[PDB]
Design an enzyme around this catalytic site. Structure first.
Site, PDB file in Angstrom:
ATOM      1  N   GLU A 106       3.917   9.711   5.224  1.00  0.00           N
ATOM      2  CA  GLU A 106       2.927   8.972   4.411  1.00  0.00           C
ATOM      3  C   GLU A 106       1.643   9.776   4.391  1.00  0.00           C
ATOM      4  O   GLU A 106       0.965   9.875   3.351  1.00  0.00           O
ATOM      5  CB  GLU A 106       2.720   7.590   4.976  1.00  0.00           C
TER       6      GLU A 106
ATOM      7  N   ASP B 267      14.384 -14.901 -12.291  1.00  0.00           N
ATOM      8  CA  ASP B 267      14.332 -13.567 -12.925  1.00  0.00           C
ATOM      9  C   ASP B 267      13.080 -13.403 -13.784  1.00  0.00           C
ATOM     10  O   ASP B 267      12.506 -12.307 -13.853  1.00  0.00           O
ATOM     11  CB  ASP B 267      15.577 -13.326 -13.780  1.00  0.00           C
TER      12      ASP B 267
ATOM     13  N   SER C 262     -12.896  -3.484 -31.822  1.00  0.00           N
ATOM     14  CA  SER C 262     -12.772  -4.908 -31.522  1.00  0.00           C
ATOM     15  C   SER C 262     -11.863  -5.166 -30.356  1.00  0.00           C
ATOM     16  O   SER C 262     -10.775  -4.546 -30.234  1.00  0.00           O
ATOM     17  CB  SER C 262     -12.233  -5.710 -32.716  1.00  0.00           C
TER      18      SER C 262
ATOM     19  N   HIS D  55       1.571   1.083 -14.623  1.00  0.00           N
ATOM     20  CA  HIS D  55       1.102  -0.317 -14.715  1.00  0.00           C
ATOM     21  C   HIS D  55      -0.136  -0.326 -15.648  1.00  0.00           C
ATOM     22  O   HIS D  55      -1.041   0.481 -15.458  1.00  0.00           O
ATOM     23  CB  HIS D  55       0.682  -0.822 -13.316  1.00  0.00           C
TER      24      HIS D  55
HETATM   25  O1  LIG Z   1      -2.034  10.598   0.282  1.00  0.00           O
HETATM   26  C1  LIG Z   1      -2.453   9.428   0.099  1.00  0.00           C
HETATM   27  O2  LIG Z   1      -2.424   8.825  -1.002  1.00  0.00           O
HETATM   28  C2  LIG Z   1      -3.043   8.631   1.308  1.00  0.00           C
HETATM   29  C3  LIG Z   1      -2.654   9.227   2.674  1.00  0.00           C
HETATM   30  C4  LIG Z   1      -3.459   8.496   3.800  1.00  0.00           C
HETATM   31  N1  LIG Z   1      -3.264   7.033   3.791  1.00  0.00           N
HETATM   32  P1  LIG Z   1      -3.711   6.172   5.208  1.00  0.00           P
HETATM   33  O3  LIG Z   1      -4.690   7.123   5.986  1.00  0.00           O
HETATM   34  O4  LIG Z   1      -2.534   5.827   6.041  1.00  0.00           O
HETATM   35  O5  LIG Z   1      -4.477   4.914   4.649  1.00  0.00           O
HETATM   36  C5  LIG Z   1      -5.578   5.046   3.755  1.00  0.00           C
HETATM   37  C6  LIG Z   1      -6.852   4.550   4.478  1.00  0.00           C
HETATM   38  C7  LIG Z   1      -7.976   4.231   3.447  1.00  0.00           C
HETATM   39  C8  LIG Z   1      -7.841   2.803   2.912  1.00  0.00           C
HETATM   40  N2  LIG Z   1      -9.126   2.391   2.295  1.00  0.00           N
HETATM   41  C9  LIG Z   1      -9.249   1.240   1.641  1.00  0.00           C
HETATM   42  O6  LIG Z   1      -8.322   0.439   1.495  1.00  0.00           O
HETATM   43  C10 LIG Z   1     -10.659   0.922   1.103  1.00  0.00           C
HETATM   44  C11 LIG Z   1     -10.827   1.586  -0.260  1.00  0.00           C
HETATM   45  C12 LIG Z   1     -12.062   1.025  -0.984  1.00  0.00           C
HETATM   46  N3  LIG Z   1     -11.807  -0.352  -1.480  1.00  0.00           N
HETATM   47  C13 LIG Z   1     -12.786  -1.279  -1.491  1.00  0.00           C
HETATM   48  O7  LIG Z   1     -13.946  -1.037  -1.139  1.00  0.00           O
HETATM   49  C14 LIG Z   1     -12.416  -2.683  -2.042  1.00  0.00           C
HETATM   50  C15 LIG Z   1     -11.213  -3.325  -1.341  1.00  0.00           C
HETATM   51  C16 LIG Z   1     -11.525  -3.757   0.097  1.00  0.00           C
HETATM   52  C17 LIG Z   1     -12.510  -4.941   0.175  1.00  0.00           C
HETATM   53  C18 LIG Z   1     -12.596  -5.278   1.667  1.00  0.00           C
HETATM   54  N4  LIG Z   1     -13.633  -6.246   2.101  1.00  0.00           N
HETATM   55  C19 LIG Z   1     -13.268  -7.321   2.816  1.00  0.00           C
HETATM   56  O8  LIG Z   1     -12.091  -7.597   3.043  1.00  0.00           O
HETATM   57  C20 LIG Z   1     -14.347  -8.092   3.272  1.00  0.00           C
HETATM   58  C21 LIG Z   1     -15.457  -8.249   2.450  1.00  0.00           C
HETATM   59  C22 LIG Z   1     -16.561  -8.993   2.873  1.00  0.00           C
HETATM   60  C23 LIG Z   1     -16.573  -9.564   4.143  1.00  0.00           C
HETATM   61  F1  LIG Z   1     -17.747 -10.328   4.563  1.00  0.00           F
HETATM   62  C24 LIG Z   1     -15.464  -9.394   4.983  1.00  0.00           C
HETATM   63  C25 LIG Z   1     -14.364  -8.649   4.550  1.00  0.00           C
HETATM   64  C26 LIG Z   1     -12.444   1.985  -2.124  1.00  0.00           C
HETATM   65  O9  LIG Z   1     -12.523   1.489  -3.276  1.00  0.00           O
HETATM   66  O10 LIG Z   1     -12.606   3.206  -1.831  1.00  0.00           O
HETATM   67  C27 LIG Z   1      -7.449   1.851   4.085  1.00  0.00           C
HETATM   68  O11 LIG Z   1      -8.375   1.301   4.735  1.00  0.00           O
HETATM   69  O12 LIG Z   1      -6.228   1.697   4.331  1.00  0.00           O
HETATM   70  C28 LIG Z   1      -4.920   8.901   3.629  1.00  0.00           C
HETATM   71  O13 LIG Z   1      -5.694   8.096   3.050  1.00  0.00           O
HETATM   72  O14 LIG Z   1      -5.220  10.052   4.047  1.00  0.00           O
HETATM   73 ZN   LIG Z   2      -1.632   4.896   7.428  1.00  0.00          ZN
HETATM   74 ZN   LIG Z   3      -3.988   7.695   7.728  1.00  0.00          ZN
END
Ligand SMILES: O=C(O)CC[C@H](NP(=O)(O)OCCC[C@H](NC(=O)CC[C@H](NC(=O)CCCCCNC(=O)c1ccc(F)cc1)C(=O)O)C(=O)O)C(=O)O
Ligand SMILES: [Zn+2]
Ligand SMILES: [Zn+2]
Ligand SMILES: *[C@@H]1O[C@H](CO)[C@@H](O[C@@H]2O[C@H](CO)[C@@H](O[C@@H]3O[C@H](CO[C@H]4O[C@H](CO)[C@@H](O)[C@H](O)[C@@H]4O)[C@@H](O)[C@H](O[C@H]4O[C@H](CO)[C@@H](O)[C@H](O)[C@@H]4O)[C@@H]3O)[C@H](O)[C@H]2NC(C)=O)[C@H](O)[C@H]1NC(C)=O
Ligand SMILES: *[C@@H]1O[C@H](CO)[C@@H](O[C@@H]2O[C@H](CO)[C@@H](O[C@@H]3O[C@H](CO[C@H]4O[C@H](CO)[C@@H](O)[C@H](O)[C@@H]4O)[C@@H](O)[C@H](O[C@H]4O[C@H](CO)[C@@H](O)[C@H](O)[C@@H]4O)[C@@H]3O)[C@H](O)[C@H]2NC(C)=O)[C@H](O)[C@H]1NC(C)=O
Ligand SMILES: O=C(O)CC[C@H](NP(=O)(O)OCCC[C@H](NC(=O)CC[C@H](NC(=O)CCCCCNC(=O)c1ccc(F)cc1)C(=O)O)C(=O)O)C(=O)O
Ligand SMILES: *[C@@H]1O[C@H](CO)[C@@H](O[C@@H]2O[C@H](CO)[C@@H](O[C@@H]3O[C@H](CO)[C@@H](O)[C@H](O)[C@@H]3O)[C@H](O)[C@H]2NC(C)=O)[C@H](O)[C@H]1NC(C)=O
Ligand SMILES: *[C@@H]1O[C@H](CO)[C@@H](O[C@@H]2O[C@H](CO)[C@@H](O[C@@H]3O[C@H](CO)[C@@H](O)[C@H](O)[C@@H]3O)[C@H](O)[C@H]2NC(C)=O)[C@H](O)[C@H]1NC(C)=O
Ligand SMILES: *[C@@H]1O[C@H](CO[C@@H]2O[C@@H](C)[C@@H](O)[C@@H](O)[C@@H]2O)[C@@H](O[C@@H]2O[C@H](CO)[C@@H](O)[C@H](O)[C@H]2NC(C)=O)[C@H](O)[C@H]1NC(C)=O
Ligand SMILES: *[C@@H]1O[C@H](CO[C@@H]2O[C@@H](C)[C@@H](O)[C@@H](O)[C@@H]2O)[C@@H](O[C@@H]2O[C@H](CO)[C@@H](O)[C@H](O)[C@H]2NC(C)=O)[C@H](O)[C@H]1NC(C)=O
Ligand SMILES: *[C@@H]1O[C@H](CO)[C@@H](O[C@@H]2O[C@H](CO)[C@@H](O)[C@H](O)[C@H]2NC(C)=O)[C@H](O)[C@H]1NC(C)=O
Ligand SMILES: *[C@@H]1O[C@H](CO)[C@@H](O[C@@H]2O[C@H](CO)[C@@H](O)[C@H](O)[C@H]2NC(C)=O)[C@H](O)[C@H]1NC(C)=O
Ligand SMILES: *[C@@H]1O[C@H](CO)[C@@H](O[C@@H]2O[C@H](CO)[C@@H](O)[C@H](O)[C@H]2NC(C)=O)[C@H](O)[C@H]1NC(C)=O
Ligand SMILES: *[C@@H]1O[C@H](CO)[C@@H](O[C@@H]2O[C@H](CO)[C@@H](O)[C@H](O)[C@H]2NC(C)=O)[C@H](O)[C@H]1NC(C)=O
Ligand SMILES: *[C@@H]1O[C@H](CO)[C@@H](O)[C@H](O)[C@H]1NC(C)=O
Ligand SMILES: *[C@@H]1O[C@H](CO)[C@@H](O)[C@H](O)[C@H]1NC(C)=O
Ligand SMILES: *[C@@H]1O[C@H](CO)[C@@H](O)[C@H](O)[C@H]1NC(C)=O
Ligand SMILES: *[C@@H]1O[C@H](CO)[C@@H](O)[C@H](O)[C@H]1NC(C)=O
Ligand SMILES: [Ca+2]
Ligand SMILES: [Ca+2]
Ligand SMILES: [Cl-]
Ligand SMILES: [Cl-]
Ligand SMILES: [Zn+2]
Ligand SMILES: [Zn+2]
Lengths: 694, 694
Positions: free
Chosen positions: B370, B610, B574, B633
Site C-alpha cells: 500500500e 441489486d 447553464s 466516478h
Molecule cells: O500512494 C498513495 O496513494 C498513498 C500511500 C500512503 N497511504 P497511508 O500513509 O497508509 O495513508 C495516508 C495518510 C494520509 C491520510 N490523510 C487524510 O485522510 C486527510 C486528508 C485531508 N482531508 C481533510 O482535511 C478532510 C477530511 C478529514 C476531516 C477530518 N476532521 C474530523 O474528523 C474532525 C473535524 C473536526 C473536529 F472537531 C473533530 C474531528 C486533505 O484534504 O488533505 C490519512 O490520514 O489516512 C501515503 O499517504 O504515503
Molecule cells: Zn496506511
Molecule cells: Zn502510510
C-alpha cells in the site's frame, strides 16, 4: 397451453406479407417526416397488439442529404473545360413508381462537398490488399488522383478510408455486373438483377462504434454538448459518389496506364480494367470532375421502444431490435425484417391478452438512422448503458429477413449455438425437397460448417448492423438469423438490388418469397430464440460452446504468428499463456455445466443465471481495443479492414497484420506479446466468473 | 443468539493490544522477507480463526529501495566543492530498538537517481497556490533550482509534480515543527511529538489510480507484459529526499533573496523563511547538493485473502480490507488497523464455529505494498474486476484505527450515512464525560457537520488509501472510520510521528490508547458496518442521502462558476440540466424508498437489493475523467491538487479551476459546458436505475 408452440403457431405468413406491403409504399429515409409518421404508426399498433408500454425515444444526430436544388454528379471534362459526359441525376424509377415523390437520389452519405478534377486510378475493391498491390508491387501512386473502386467484399467506409490514406482526392464507387448481375437472370423488373442505371446508396463513415459523430460516449439528447464538425468522429475527408455500371463503363472504357495485374482485378464490363493513371493517348488531356454538394445536418430521429414486462424477472431484458429507416422503399432492407418484428409483437401480444407473461422482460425496438451509422440503436444504448450492462440478457437483431431463398443463415455468439441447434430441430424446413424434415436438417445439409464437421455453419458477428453497440461495446450475448443464397455457387455480392430504388415490395413478392414461407421460417427462428431466452428457467447459453471456439481461435492466431518463426525466437513470443487460459476455461466451463445440471433453489438458479448472463460481459475490456475505445470485446471485433467482418482475437490479429513491413520489429513484436497477455488474462478472467463464487 | 450484539460483545480490547504488539516488533517493509513471513502468519491464523478459505495472492510490482552501500544524503557544498554540512544517514533509533536490524533509512520512494547541485528556493507547502504565488506574484523562477518544501496540507506526490512543472531540478521535503510539533507536548519518547532527527518516509508517485507503474489495467501476474521504465506510470523526473527539522534548519538559516510574502509561509523554526533563491551575501557562493542512489526493482508482494462464504447470497461480497506493509514498525499505520481486522476475523470466526454464517459472503484482506502506491489492492482488483463489478456490495477500509483520542472520524459514500448514524447510536461512547451515552451522541457533540446542522461530520473519499480502486475505479460503495484528534484546536498535520522510526507499539500503548478502548470502539464501528452490510435482508443503503448531497454539490459547483457571470452570459453556460437531473434523482429516490418499504418476494427483494448495489456503480463513466482513465466516478475523484482530498463534480471543478488564466476562454468555457452535460447525464442515468425496471 401458453408455450413456445402456441407462440409459433400464431405467427402467419399472410400477416408478414400485409405488413411488408404497408411499410414499403413510400420511402422512409431517416430524419424525414414520413419516417416519423411510420414510427407513430408502429407505436400505436404495438400498443393495440397488447404491449405494456410503447414510447418514442428521440435524439438529434448528424445526418447527411443531397442538396435538392444543386444535384451531385460526375463529369468527364475536356481541355477547354466542357463537360462532355455526365453521370445520371437519379435512377430510372420502377414500373408504377414513376410518380412517387421524395426518392432520395443516389449519394454517399457524409461525403464532404467539393469539385475535384483529376486523373482516374482504378483500385479494384479498394481493399487493404488492393492498395498494397498498387503501391508496393505496381508502383502506382494514388496521391492527388481520383480513385474508382467497385463495390463488394468490404464495407464501403473502409474503401474510402483506404483511398484517403493512399492520398486520393476523391472516390467514385460503382456496381460492377461481375458483383451485381447473376448470369441467366434478368434485370429488374423482369428479374432480381441490378440494371445498368441502378445505384447503391450508403454511408461512408468510419465510426468504429461511436454512434452519432458529434456525441461519442453520451446520448444526443436536448442538453447534449456537441463536438464541432472539425472534431466529429469518422467523417471522410474527400468527396465520394456512387454510380451504376452504364455510367462506370463510360468512365472506365478510356482508361490507360498500366494493365490490370491479374484476372481478379477484371469485372464483367467490356473494358480492359486498366489501372491508370488517366486515359489512353487520344484522351490523355481529358479529366474526371466530381460535383458534390451534400450537407451534414443535425436532425431528429425516433426509436420505438415496446416493453412486455416479465412476470418473475422483470429486471432481466431480452431485446428484439431492428431498424425502420430505409434508403428508399426498403423492400428487403429493413422492412422484410420490420414486418417480421411486427408479427412477432402481435403474436406475443395475443398470448398476453389471454393472461400470459414471459418470465423475463422483452423489449422490442424499431431503430432509426441505422443507415447513417447505427445511430438510433447506439444513442439509446448510450442513454441506457447502465441498465443494459447489469440487466441485458441477449440481443436478437431483426434487419432483412431474406437475401436469398436457399437456406438459413445464422451469425451469433457461441453462447447461442446450442439454443439455435435445438430450436431449428423443432422447426419445419420450408425448403423444396425437405417437406416433413426439420429446418436443422435442411440447413445442415445445405450449409455445412467449415469449422466443425457435421454441424451447420454459424458465422461470427462484426459490425454494420444494430447488434454492434450491444455486442462489441457492452458485451451482451447477441445473434441474428435470415434466409440466404447459396454462397458456394454464386459470385455476386449480398443481394443485387441492395440500396437501390428497385428494392421494392414487388421484388420480394415476385422473386424472393412469393408465399412468404421463408419470412415465416425467419419469424419462427427469431421469435423462438426470443421466447426461449425470455422464458427458459435456466438461460439457454452453453459456456462449453465458447470453450471449443476459443481453442479454434487460439490455434488460428498461433498459426498466423508461426509464419514468423525467427522473430518468435528472437523476441521470445509465446502463446503458452493463451493456451493455458483456454485450457482453464474448458475445465471450469465443464464443471460449471455439471453444477448447472445438479442443483428448488431460486438463489442458486439466479446466481447461476447471472453467471451465464455475465459471461459474455466478462470478455469486455474497459480500456477498449487500441485506438478503438468503443470496441471493447477481446474475443471479437469488427475487422479493421472491413467493418462487416468479425475478427477473432482482434487485438493480437491487428498486432500481427503486415508485421514484416514494420520499421521497428522489436516494438512491433513487443506489442504482439502485449496483446497475447491481454487476451490470456481476459480469457482466464472470464473463466473465473464461472468458478464457484465463494 | 447469533446477532450483531453477539459479534460485537466477542471483540476484546486485550486481544487488539496483543495483536498490535505482535505485528510491530520488527519492520514489515513491502517486498521484504519479514513481510512475507507476516503474510504467512496471518494466513495461518485466519484459517485457525475459522475462515472457509485463506489464500495468498501474489504479484510482481515495481518497488523502490535505498542502496545499502551507497547512502542517500544532502549537502551544503562550498566553492571548492567541500561538503561542509551533511544531512543524517538514519533517524536515531528509539529506546530499546537501537539494535533492531532492517530499519529502512528515510528516503522518498521512486525518486530517480541523481546528484544535482544548485541554489535553494523555499516553496512553503509546494501547493498549486504556493507556486502561483511564487511565479505570478513574486516573479520567482524555480527553473533549475532545488526546491525545499514543508510537508503537510497535501499529498507529497502532488508537491513533487508541482515542483517538476515549475522547472525544479530536485526537491527536499522536511517536517516543520509548526506542522509536526504540538505546543506543550514532549518529543518522543517522552511525548507524541516528532523530534528534530525524525523524518517522514513516503512514496512520491502520481499514479492517478493506475496501481503498479508497469502494468496499468491488468494484474502484474507471471505472464504480464510490462512497460519499459521510460513508459511507466507516475514516476518523478527529479530527485527527492526527506529530512527532519534539525537538518532543515541548517539548510534554511542561510537563505537570502526575497522575504516570505506573508505569515502563512512562516513555520516555527528560528529562521526568516526567505524564499530565495540561494543564500545571503557571505554564503552566496555555497550551493546545495543532493546524492540520491535509490533503485526501482520489480519485487514480489503478497495479499492475504480470507473468505467467509454467505449462506444465502454467496455471490454478493462485503469486503473488509486494510494494508499490512509498513515503512518501519507501523505502530499506528497500518498495524493499529490490521490488529483490529484480526480481532474482527476472530470474532466472526467464533460465530461461524457455532454454526452461524452471514447472509452474504465476507472477504477479508491484508493488502501488501500500500505504501508504494496502493499496489496490492489495485493489482488484486484488476485481476478480479469482473467479479467485483457484478458482485461487490461494499468495501470497508481498515488502515490506522487512531490518529488521536478525541472523537470518531468517518469518511464514506452518502449511501452509508444512515447505516453509520444508526450503528453509532447503538454503540457506547468510550469518551470521558460521556459514560452511559451513545457513540453517536459524543461524536455529534465533538464533530458537528459543517454541511448539515445537528448531524455529525462525515467526510468525502479521495485517494491515498486502499479504498481507491474499489470506489473511484470500480464504483463499489466504500467507507472508513477511525478515532481522530480535535482538528479545530490543533494546527499540526495528521499525527506527528507518521512514517518515522518512532511510530511504535509504545507510542500507541503509552500515549494514544493505553486501555485500547478507542481501538475497541473502532473495531465495533468497522465490524458492525460489515455485519450489517453482510447480514441485513435489505442492503442498508439510503439513496435519499445521495439526493441531498448531490444538491449540495450542485449548489457548490454553480457558486464557483458564478464568480464569472460575464463569461457565463457570453458562452451561454447553464447549470439547468444538472439541477434538473438532481431534482429527478430526488424524486425517483423518494419513490424507490416508498417501494422498498412497501414490498415475502425474494426476487423483488434481490431486484431491489441489486438496484441498491448498482447505484454507486451507476456513477461510473467508462470513459473516465479527462487524462485520468482510472478515476471513473463522476461525483467524486481525488483532487488533481491533492490526492488525499475528495473533490465533488471533479470534471466540472477542474474545467473551472483557474479558468481566468486560460488563453482561449471560448474553448475553456466550452469544456465547462461539456462537463456539465456529462455530470447531468450521469446523475439522470443513476436516477433511472432506481426507476421501476419495466
Ligand atoms: O500512494 C498513495 O496513494 C498513498 C500511500 C500512503 N497511504 P497511508 O500513509 O497508509 O495513508 C495516508 C495518510 C494520509 C491520510 N490523510 C487524510 O485522510 C486527510 C486528508 C485531508 N482531508 C481533510 O482535511 C478532510 C477530511 C478529514 C476531516 C477530518 N476532521 C474530523 O474528523 C474532525 C473535524 C473536526 C473536529 F472537531 C473533530 C474531528 C486533505 O484534504 O488533505 C490519512 O490520514 O489516512 C501515503 O499517504 O504515503
Ligand atoms: Zn496506511
Ligand atoms: Zn502510510
Ligand atoms: C490456469 O490455471 C492454473 C491453475 O490450475 C494456473 O496455475 C497457476 O499458474 C501460476 C503461473 O504459472 C503459478 O504461479 C506460481 O505460483 C507459485 C506459488 O504458488 C503457491 O501459492 C499459490 C497461492 O498463493 C498456490 O495456489 C500454489 O499451489 C502454491 O501454494 C510461485 O512460487 C511461482 O513463482 C516461481 O516460479 C516462477 C516460474 O519459474 C518464477 O518466475 C518465479 O520467479 C518464482 O520462482 C509462480 O508465480 C500458480 O501457482 C498456479 N496456480 C495453481 C497451480 O494453483 C494458471 O495460471 C492458469 N492460466 C492462466 C493463463 O491464468
Ligand atoms: C428530468 O425528468 C423530466 C421528466 O419528468 C425530463 O423531462 C424531459 O425533458 C426533455 C428535455 O427538456 C423533454 O424533451 C422534449 O420532448 C418533446 C417531445 O416529448 C414527447 O415525447 C416524449 C417521449 O417520446 C413524451 O415523454 C413527452 O411527454 C411528449 O409526448 C420534444 O418535442 C421537445 O423538443 C422541442 O422543444 C425543444 C425545447 O424548445 C426544442 O429544442 C426542440 O427543437 C423541439 O421543438 C423536447 O425534446 C421531454 O419531453 C421530457 N420528458 C417528459 C416531460 O416526460 C428531464 O429531461 C429530466 N432531466 C434530465 C437532466 O434528464
Ligand atoms: O453504418 C454501418 O455500420 C452499416 C449501415 C448499413 N447497414 P445495412 O445496409 O442495414 O446492413 C449491412 C448489409 C451488409 C451485411 N453483410 C454481411 O453480413 C456479409 C459480410 C461478410 N461476411 C462474410 O462473408 C461471412 C459471414 C456470412 C457467411 C454467410 N454464408 C452462408 O450463410 C452460407 C454459406 C454457404 C452456403 F452453401 C450457404 C450459406 C464480410 O466479411 O464482408 C448484411 O448482409 O447484412 C450499411 O451497411 O450501409
Ligand atoms: C439442447 O438440447 C439438449 C438435448 O436435449 C439439452 O441437453 C440435455 O439437457 C438435459 C436437461 O438438463 C440433460 O438432462 C440431464 O440428464 C442428467 C443425466 O445424464 C441428469 O443428471 C439431469 O438431472 C438431467 O435429467 C441432458 O443430459 C442433456 N443432453 C445432452 C447434453 O445430450 C441441452 O441442454 C439443450 N441446450 C440448450 C437448451 O441450450
Ligand atoms: C436507520 O434507522 C431508521 C429508524 O429506525 C430506519 O428507518 C425506519 O425503517 C423502518 C423499517 O423499514 C420503517 O418502518 C416502516 O414504517 C412504515 C409506517 O410508517 C411502514 O409502511 C413499514 O411497513 C415499516 O414498518 C420506519 O418508518 C423508518 N423510520 C424512519 C425513516 O424514521 C432506517 O431504515 C435505518 N437506516 C438504515 C438501516 O440504513
Ligand atoms: C453536363 O452538365 C453540365 C451542367 O449542367 C447543369 O447541371 C445539371 C445537373 C442540370 O441541372 C443542367 O440543366 C444544368 O445546366 C452541362 O454544362 C452546362 O451547360 C449549360 C447550358 O448549355 C451552360 O450554360 C453551363 O455553363 C454549363 N455548366 C457547366 C458546369 O459547364 C453540360 O452540357 C452537360 N454535358 C452533357 C454532355 O450533357
Ligand atoms: C559529508 O560527507 C562527505 C562524503 O563522505 C562519505 O559518505 C558518507 C555517507 C559516509 O559514508 C562517509 O564515511 C563517506 O566518506 C565527506 O566528504 C568525504 O570525505 C572523505 C574523507 O575525508 C574524502 O576522502 C572524500 O573524498 C569526501 N567525499 C566527498 C564526496 O567529498 C564530508 O567530509 C562530510 N562533511 C562533513 C562536514 O561531515
Ligand atoms: C399502413 O397501415 C396502417 C394501420 O392500419 C394504416 O394507418 C391507418 O389508416 C387509417 C385510414 O387512413 C386511419 O384511419 C388509421 O388511423 C390508421 N392507423 C394507424 C396510423 O395506426 C396506413 O394507412 C397503412 N399505410 C399504407 C401505405 O397502406
Ligand atoms: C443548395 O443549393 C442552392 C442552389 O444553388 C443554394 O441556394 C443558393 O444560396 C446562395 C447563397 O448561399 C443564394 O444567394 C442563392 O440565391 C441560392 N440559390 C437558389 C437557387 O436558391 C443553397 O444554399 C444550398 N443549400 C444548402 C447548402 O443547404
Ligand atoms: C506473533 O504471533 C505468532 C502467532 O502466535 C507467533 O508465531 C508462532 O510462534 C511459535 C513459537 O515460535 C511457533 O511455534 C508457531 O508456529 C507460530 N505460529 C504461527 C506463525 O502462526 C509469533 O512468534 C509472534 N511474533 C512475535 C514477534 O511475537
Ligand atoms: C549500490 O552501490 C554499490 C556501492 O557503490 C554498487 O556496487 C558497485 O558497483 C560497481 C559497478 O556498478 C562495482 O565495480 C563496484 O565494485 C561496486 N562497489 C561495491 C562497494 O560493491 C552497486 O551497484 C549499487 N547497487 C545497485 C545500483 O543496485
Ligand atoms: C506520390 O506523389 C506525391 C507527389 O505529388 C509525393 O509527395 C508522394 O510522396 C508520392 N509517393 C510515392 C510513394 O512515390
Ligand atoms: C429462388 O429459388 C429458385 C429455385 O432454386 C432459384 O432458381 C431462384 O434463383 C431463387 N430466387 C432468388 C431471388 O434467389
Ligand atoms: C525561468 O528560467 C529559464 C532560464 O534558465 C527560462 O528558460 C524560463 O522560461 C524562465 N521562466 C520565466 C517565467 O521567466
Ligand atoms: C489524549 O487525550 C488527552 C485528554 O484530552 C489529551 O490531553 C492528550 O493530548 C491526548 N493524546 C493524544 C496522543 O492525542
Ligand atoms: Ca452519442
Ligand atoms: Ca497492474
Ligand atoms: Cl438481421
Ligand atoms: Cl482507514
Ligand atoms: Zn438494414
Ligand atoms: Zn442497408
Amino acid at each position: 397451453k401458453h408455450n413456445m408452440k402456441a407462440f409459433l403457431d400464431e405467427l402467419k405468413a399472410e400477416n408478414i406479407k400485409k405488413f411488408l406491403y404497408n411499410f414499403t409504399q413510400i420511402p422512409h429515409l431517416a430524419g424525414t417526416e414520413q419516417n416519423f409518421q411510420l414510427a407513430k404508426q408502429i407505436q400505436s399498433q404495438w400498443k393495440e397488439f397488447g404491449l405494456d408500454s410503447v414510447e418514442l425515444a428521440h435524439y438529434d444526430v448528424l445526418l447527411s442529404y443531397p442538396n435538392k436544388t444543386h444535384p451531385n454528379y460526375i463529369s468527364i471534362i475536356n481541355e477547354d473545360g466542357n463537360e462532355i459526359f455526365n453521370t445520371s441525376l437519379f435512377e430510372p424509377p420502377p414500373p408504377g413508381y414513376e410518380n412517387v415523390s421524395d426518392i432520395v437520389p443516389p449519394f454517399s452519405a457524409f461525403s464532404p462537398q467539393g469539385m475535384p478534377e483529376g486523373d482516374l486510378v482504378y483500385v479494384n475493391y479498394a481493399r487493404t490488399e488492393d492498395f498494397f498491390k498498387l503501391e508496393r508491387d505496381m508502383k502506382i501512386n494514388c496521391s492527388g488522383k481520383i480513385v474508382i473502386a467497385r463495390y463488394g467484399k468490404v464495407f464501403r467506409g473502409n474503401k474510402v478510408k483506404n483511398a484517403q490514406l493512399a492520398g486520393a482526392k476523391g472516390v467514385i464507387l460503382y456496381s460492377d455486373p461481375a458483383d451485381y448481375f447473376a448470369p441467366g437472370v434478368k434485370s429488374y423488373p423482369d428479374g432480381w438483377n441490378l440494371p445498368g442505371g441502378g445505384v447503391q446508396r450508403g454511408n461512408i463513415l468510419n465510426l468504429n462504434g461511436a454512434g452519432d459523430p458529434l456525441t461519442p460516449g453520451y446520448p444526443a439528447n436536448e442538453y447534449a454538448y456537441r463536438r464541432g464538425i472539425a472534431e466529429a468522429v469518422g467523417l471522410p475527408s474527400i468527396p465520394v459518389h456512387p454510380i451504376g455500371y452504364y455510367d462506370a463503363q463510360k468512365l472506365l472504357e478510356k482508361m490507360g496506364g498500366s494493365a490490370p495485374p491479374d484476372s481478379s482485378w477484371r469485372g464483367s464490363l467490356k473494358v480492359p480494367y486498366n489501372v491508370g493513371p488517366g486515359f489512353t493517348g487520344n484522351f490523355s488531356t481529358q479529366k474526371v470532375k466530381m460535383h458534390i454538394h451534400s450537407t451534414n445536418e443535425v436532425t431528429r430521429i425516433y426509436n420505438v421502444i415496446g416493453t412486455l414486462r416479465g412476470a418473475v424477472e422483470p429486471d432481466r431484458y431480452v431485446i428484439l431490435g431492428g431498424h425502420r429507416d430505409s434508403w428508399v422503399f426498403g423492400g428487403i432492407d429493413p422492412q422484410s425484417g420490420a414486418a417480421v418484428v411486427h408479427e412477432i409483437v402481435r403474436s406475443f401480444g395475443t398470448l398476453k391478452k389471454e393472461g400470459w407473461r414471459p418470465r423475463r422482460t422483452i423489449l422490442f425496438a424499431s431503430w432509426d438512422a441505422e443507415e447513417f451509422g447505427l445511430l438510433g440503436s447506439t444513442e439509446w444504448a448510450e442513454e441506457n448503458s447502465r441498465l443494459l450492462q447489469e440487466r441485458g440478457v441477449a440481443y436478437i437483431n431483426a434487419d432483412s429477413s431474406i437475401e436469398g431463398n436457399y437456406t438459413l443463415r445464422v451469425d451469433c455468439t457461441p453462447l447461442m449455438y446450442s439454443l439455435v441447434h435445438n430450436l431449428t430441430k423443432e422447426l419445419k424446413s420450408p425448403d423444396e425437397g425437405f417437406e416433413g424434415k426439420s429446418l436443422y436438417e435442411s440447413w445442415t445439409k445445405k450449409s455445412p460448417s467449415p469449422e466443425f464437421s457435421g454441424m451447420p455453419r454459424i458465422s461470427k458477428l462484426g459490425s454494420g448492423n444494430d447488434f454492434e453497440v450491444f455486442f462489441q461495446r457492452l458485451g451482451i450475448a447477441s445473434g441474428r438469423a435470415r434466409y440466404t443464397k447459396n454462397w458456394e455457387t454464386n459470385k455476386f455480392s449480398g443481394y443485387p438490388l441492395y440500396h437501390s430504388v428497385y428494392e421494392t415490395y414487388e421484388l420480394v413478392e415476385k422473386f424472393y418469397d412469393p408465399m412468404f414461407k421463408y419470412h415465416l421460417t425467419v419469424a419462427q427462428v427469431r421469435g423462438g430464440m426470443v421466447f426461449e431466452l425470455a422464458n427458459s428457467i435456466v438461460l439457454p447459453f452453453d459456456c462449453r460452446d465458447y470453450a471449443v471456439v476459443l481453442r479454434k481461435y487460439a490455434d488460428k492466431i498461433y498459426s498466423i504468428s508461426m509464419k514468423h518463426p525467427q522473430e518468435m525466437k528472437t523476441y521470445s513470443v509465446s502463446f503458452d499463456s493463451l493456451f493455458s487460459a483456454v485450457k482453464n476455461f474448458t475445465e471450469i466451463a465443464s464443471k460449471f455445466s455439471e453444477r448447472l445440471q445438479d442443483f428448488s433453489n431460486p438463489i442458486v438458479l439466479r446466481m447461476m443465471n447471472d453467471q451465464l448472463m455475465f459471461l459474455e460481459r466478462a470478455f469486455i475490456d474497459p480500456l477498449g481495443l487500441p485506438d478503438r475505445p468503443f470496441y471493447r470485446h477481446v474475443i471479437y471485433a469488427p475487422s479493421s479492414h472491413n467493418k462487416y467482418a468479425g475478427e477473432s482475437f482482434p487485438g493480437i490479429y491487428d498486432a500481427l497484420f503486415d508485421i514484416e513491413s514494420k520499421v521497428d520489429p522489436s516494438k512491433a513484436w513487443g506489442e504482439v506479446k502485449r496483446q497475447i497477455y491481454v487476451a490470456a488474462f481476459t480469457v482466464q478472467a472470464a473463466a473465473e466468473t464461472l468458478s464457484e463464487v465463494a
